[PDB]
Design a protein around this ligand. Structure first.
Ligand SMILES: CCCc1csc2c1-c1nc(SCC(=O)C(C)(C)C)ncc1CC2
Length: 147
């Protein structure tokens, strides 16, 4: 099990990848985003990281656009103090990859397809979710208009 580095400070993984404490400390990670409703905050009692949980299920009606600005402010906090951030969910990495792509669209000014081809090249196994794709497509259209 390994942690996929999208950007040098932004990391994508799953339930199994987030339980490796030695690797996360070797990568200078201090922030963790859990994009699930039921997974525990791993290594919480150890007091090593800053946690933010985005309660979401892997359904065809779940809303992830509501969590974008909340997750961006948490990423910019890690970027501002030089620490890395790990965002994860489950095996399909659908929910966590949706947020990673949305970040690349806003602060890197990439298009959705280019940001998807970028993430897919680093983590090849991404389960598709048409609901989240429609939210990224509408979010891409709001970035091109000013929302
Ligand atoms: C997000 C953009 C995806 C896309 C744009 S154009 C195209 C795709 C695509 N996506 C997928 S799975 C990606 C997702 O659904 C996540 C939200 C979990 C990242 N499989 C096959 C294709 C073939 C053609």
């Amino acid at each position: 099990a390994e942690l996929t580095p999208i950007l040098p400070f932004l990391f994508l993984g799953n339930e199994q990848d987030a339980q490796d404490l030695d690797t996360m400390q070797r990568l200078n990670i201090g922030y963790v985003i859990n994009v699930t409703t039921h997974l525990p905050l791993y290594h919480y009692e150890k007091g090593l990281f800053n946690y933010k949980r985005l309660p979401a299920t892997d359904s065809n009606k779940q809303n992830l656009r509501q969590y974008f600005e909340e997750a961006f402010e948490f990423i910019e906090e890690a970027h501002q103090c030089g620490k890395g951030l790990l965002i994860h969910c489950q095996a399909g990495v659908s929910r966590s990859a949706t947020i990673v792509i949305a970040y690349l669209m806003k602060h890197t000014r990439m298009t959705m397809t280019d940001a998807y081809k970028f993430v897919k090249g680093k983590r090849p196994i991404i389960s598709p979710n048409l609901n989240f794709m429609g939210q990224l497509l509408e979010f891409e259209e709001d970035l091109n208009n000013g929302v």
